[PDB]
Design a protein around this nucleic acid. Sequence first.
DNA 1: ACTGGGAAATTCCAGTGAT
DNA 2: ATCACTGGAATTTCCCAGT
Lengths: 275, 275
Amino acid sequence: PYVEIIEQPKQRGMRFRYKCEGRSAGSIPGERSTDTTKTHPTIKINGYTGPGTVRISLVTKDPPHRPHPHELVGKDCRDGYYEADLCPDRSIHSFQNLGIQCVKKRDLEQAISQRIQTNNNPFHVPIEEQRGDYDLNAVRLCFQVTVRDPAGRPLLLTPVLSHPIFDNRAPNTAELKICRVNRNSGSCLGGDEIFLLCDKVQKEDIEVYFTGPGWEARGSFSQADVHRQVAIVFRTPPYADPSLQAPVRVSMQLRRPSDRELSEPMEFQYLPDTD
Amino acid sequence: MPYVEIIEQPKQRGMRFRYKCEGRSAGSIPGERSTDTTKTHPTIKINGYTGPGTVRISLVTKDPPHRPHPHELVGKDCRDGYYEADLCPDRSIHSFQNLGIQCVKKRDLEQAISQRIQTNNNPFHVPIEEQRGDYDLNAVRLCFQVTVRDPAGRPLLLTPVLSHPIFDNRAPNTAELKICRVNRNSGSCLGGDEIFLLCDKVQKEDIEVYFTGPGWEARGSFSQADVHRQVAIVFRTPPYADPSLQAPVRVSMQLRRPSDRELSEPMEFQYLPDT
DNA sequence: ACTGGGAAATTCCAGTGAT
DNA sequence: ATCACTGGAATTTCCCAGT
């Protein structure tokens, strides 16, 4: 038998909580979770239905896939991992209260030691590897299901990794959001100056991205024009057609080149430049 | 009575207090009239003496019961949070080029006060039962304590002299106010024009934009919600003194912190006549 | 009793200006 | 070149509001 992830966790928008915040972290939602309806990380076991248990732990994003210093917290969690029974009737199982508690950099070595001491090492990575640098802003869930064989001995199935889950404090992997913009129309000739207030971006890895049917342009600005990661002063690009007869609605959004993430689109109208 | 005179006061705003983690030495406090082309430093002159002696500089509280401050002076010839070196015998004027302010953590406050007492760092001999009230960690004063010699070489302790207060640039509340950028620097004399203004960090509960002319005083209109991550303000210009303005008039526009009434450099704004 | 989010407090660090 | 220093950014802690 083997495990497949039916509903991946949502990658973005989750805030890892420190222990100093004595409140337990949130509940990780599934990809397709919408503000209306709430999905949850969900797996399915193909090749077996009946009594079993599941352990979920955090491992690193990048390929050694060693146990992450962060902890799962929530119901049925201890020593930074979740563990509980599967339903024997169903072959689909969901996890409604998985929270991520980030540990501090100074408490790293202690955290790693606990992973080893608690035998929380799904891919049995040697301790040699586990003195590499960790990305504390990204984790993967690791599903480790145990079923019964025909004799009723526990059978451990291959661990499956989720997609990465990113801390939304991390600007390099956060959601892009335009909060306020001082102007939403401009000359088709381009070069109109726009003040745009946004959520935290990295000035070396952000652009303003105008799009239409089979068209794209970028607003002009330097890294100096990005103010304290939360504002961009830029000039609009010229529109494809230099002699518009009438206004033309296009979309304006933030774009992060590194991972090609886009923000929610906003309406911008290029106007005919007849003075 | 030989006495100490402050030739060059310390510049009050601009400089950060540094934590121990940021390293040994915390920069050099500059003089009032320090510029990029001519860097000045705090300077005293000893009137009515020449020859060998000592000078101690320590930090004291801004407010009248001048107790020793929990923060430390660090740099050349500093120990136990105070500066102490031999007075130059030849010259009567003395300046200090490596004074840095090292701020202590809130956690280590009671320990720091205990060090001040243990080291006999109490220039105004304040009783210990005053050394427990609230300290303003955002502001200190330099205390210059000069010891000269009488003709037989016995120490004569001159009166302690206080500097102007020095404020932590990094601390919100005490940071220097600055208008970095603005989308428009003109508009109707009636008001109601929307300005996107980019600024250094301000507290939205303790900030306002201040229009001033000769015998006029007005404020831009905005809510706390319009302060975006402490470094941008979207506001509406107030009405000019005279709504029957014939031809343009230039006013000053600056950030003001009501709590302590501090201001930014002024930025020109011109009220235009309404068409 | 728990949740969403802003900001103060502390730490880190890339790129300078003084030498 | 070195490295003290400058100022932006990242990390960690604290706190408010609302159900």
